[PDB]
């Protein structure tokens, strides 16, 4: 106690149900990771996120190479060396810093985040990273004569970096373009980086730290590295702890074994939140339920496999890292008309917290567990996810094409619904129809 208090306040910006108080499932994980790092006690997420009082009771009850996330992107690239759909492009808009300051801050960030400056060799028991010097990361600086010229230079960069095949064995997996505009405080940075070396949270980390440096602040020493994360995972794999979770999930899973960005209507947003609070699940849980219900009806099945995209940063020391930590784990959604909306939702919510709790279990363990019970693999086709001083704005430019047949990503800008389909299966018009069905389903469910 007085530590539950501290962690709760740090997360929600106000003292002490967690969801009722403004919380979500991800903040809940972070709360518990903070408590675990302090007090050396693991409260399971299901138990908690399934009040300050409930958490206090749970606390008292509680006892005192490349990673697979990196490797699955690296391997995918090796199987299709000319495929550039693992190239991430981030455009950072910076107002109030000089070109020299930006460049110096970028060199510091490159030195600090080794993922941005390694080469990878093939290796007998898996790929092997080797660090390069920060100076080995290309950084081109251009002066634009005006704001429109700067736009043209950026668009040129986008096209060039989008088409670039990274030589991951000999060069850093990152490239920087800095465009400064004559007689303006605005600078533009295009970070081009291979996906094996970066992810969504990494951009937020990179941009926040860039701003700190440009404001004249200092960065703390990092509590970990990608290689250490990988080593911990090698140990957890050897120990069998990850495989035992996967084997349990395999049981329930065995039977089953073009971009459009639309604002979510205010009424659908409210419906979703109401439904969530009534059932003590996350708003995302409600959104996911409706997605599964709609896709289930469309495809004409009683049970649907839905991938859930997870940040995969299970420990406090992983929160400030740059690298690829993302994981995708399967959820089975039964479409059972006999059960209440509320009960189906509570089940979805609980299965979600289960995946989140165990987001350190790599997809490959689940796949393996399924093979050991006779299935060929795990055919996930559909997925769901959610995303003073110098001004720094950072945004990914979406990757074209699609590995999964269809995904829905919810962005907490109201909400924005981003649907991405394989054109040959889910073209624009079909996605639009699915989006409308999804909105109607949420309203109905509420
Ligand atoms: P909760 O049920 O409110 O939220 C669900 C979630 C924890 C899975 C989600 O909020 C989350 O963890 N998002 C992180 C995903 C990310 O940053 N990267 C995925 C890109 S592939």
Numbering used by the authors: 740 to 755, 760 to 793, 797 to 810, 823 to 1015, 1034 to 1163, 1173 to 1198, 1201 to 1233
What did the published study say regarding this structure?
We determined crystal structures of the truncated T–C bidomain of AmbB in three forms, the apo enzyme with disordered T domain, the holo form with serine linked phosphopantetheine (Ppant) and a holo form with substrate (l-alanine) loaded onto Ppant.
Each of the two holo crystal structures have four T-C didomains in their asymmetric units. The orientation of the T domain, places Ser768 at the donor entry side of the C domain of AmbB, with the Ppant arm extending into the donor pocket towards the active site. Ppant resides in the donor pocket that leads to the catalytic groove of the C domain. At the entrance of the pocket, one of the two phosphate oxygen atoms of Ppant is hydrogen bonded to Ser1058 from the C domain. Leu769 and Phe1060 form a hydrophobic pocket around the gem dimethyl moiety of Ppant. The terminal thiol end of the Ppant is surrounded by Val1102, two negatively charged residues namely Asp957 and the highly conserved Asp958, as well as the catalytic His953.
